[PDB]
Write a structure and sequence with these properties.
With about 120 residues, the chain is mainly α. The protein contains 7 helices and no strands. Belongs to the NOP5/NOP56 family.
C-alpha cells in the first residue's frame, strides 16, 4: 500500500514535521519544492515565501486566507509566511517540535479580523 501521497506524508514526517503540521504535508512539500529544498527555504525572508506559488503565492491556498475577504488575505498571507519561515528554520536547524506556532497565528488572524 504505497501511494505517492503516502510517501510524502511520511517524507515530511522526518524532513519537516513543523511545516507539515502548519499547512499540511501537501502544501508544505510544495513550498520546499518551490524553494529548492528545506535548506534554502529556511533562508527565504518571509516576503519571499509569501509569494512562492506564482514562480499571491501558494500559501493563499491556505483555508483561513481563502475563506477570508480580500483586503484581509494579504495580511493573513504575511502572518502565515512568517510562521512558515520559522517552521522551516526550526525543522532545519533545531529538529525540535514547536507547533504552538499554530496558535500564535490562530490568534493573530483573530486580531487581523478587525476589518470591514
Amino acid at each position: 500500500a504505497g501511494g505517492l501521497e503516502d510517501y510524502i506524508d511520511k517524507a515530511m514526517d522526518d524532513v519537516a514535521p513543523n511545516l507539515k503540521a502548519l499547512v499540511g504535508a501537501k502544501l508544505g512539500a510544495r513550498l520546499i519544492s518551490l524553494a529548492g529544498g528545506l535548506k534554502e527555504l529556511a533562508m527565504l525572508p518571509s516576503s519571499t515565501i509569501q509569494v512562492l506559488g506564482a514562480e499571491h503565492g501558494v500559501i493563499y491556498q491556505y483555508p483561513a486566507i481563502n475563506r477570508s475577504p480580500w483586503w484581509q488575505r494579504g495580511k493573513i498571507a504575511r502572518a502565515l509566511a512568517g510562521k512558515l519561515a520559522i517552521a522551516a528554520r526550526v525543522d532545519y536547524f533545531s529538529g525540535e517540535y514547536i507547533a504552538e506556532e499554530l496558535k500564535k497565528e490562530l490568534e493573530a488572524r483573530i486580531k487581523e479580523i478587525k476589518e470591514k
